[PDB]
Amino acid sequence: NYERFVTATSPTVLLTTDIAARGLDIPQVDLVIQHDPPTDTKVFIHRCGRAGRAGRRGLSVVMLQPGREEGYVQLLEVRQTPITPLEHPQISVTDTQADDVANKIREQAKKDREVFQLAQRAFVSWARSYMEHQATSIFRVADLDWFDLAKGYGLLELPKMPETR
């Protein structure tokens, strides 16, 4: 899977964990996107650095949720690194017709049987990784809307995980 990416002649994209997040000189790389905030802060600086290797203009972008994780920006600011809002493109998000794109993955959740427990197990491991976050003042396991996550991950039904609803 690695060897097919380095000699790839197509606009490919890799979905990885923190394996490919440190010291990697992969040539002709431009975009890096953070779905999750890092579980530890030093990983962020190495995570952005997988875009702009020796000149070669690189875009680094991290998605965050509304709430106290908007306060994560000044966490970076005081440490050493400034953070600025995005500049281009300025189009923010597409509305609930993108939910009509987002709910599409719940359709193949019905179609394919194997993706069902794949959907659950991915979601709940995400919850386990949340309370391991070192920023106990920024990311809370209480101040998050589980329905918004379930719509985001396209969960068919919430698992029997210990937050009663």
Place this chain on the structure above:
RNA sequence: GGGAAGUCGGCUCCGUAACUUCGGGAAAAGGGCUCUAAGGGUUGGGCACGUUGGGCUUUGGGCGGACGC
């Protein structure tokens, strides 16, 4: 009865109210993070055509040249 009035000279257990042991076990509770090794062995890649031979008839030869009379 008096009280030295003699004479120098008498001094742990029962009932009631809270708390406690041994063993195993680090990481949500009782489908659950990152990375670093290892995480039992064996056997397993599709669909057609013209093509190779044996494999289904047909067409022939000799070898057997028999067996018995």
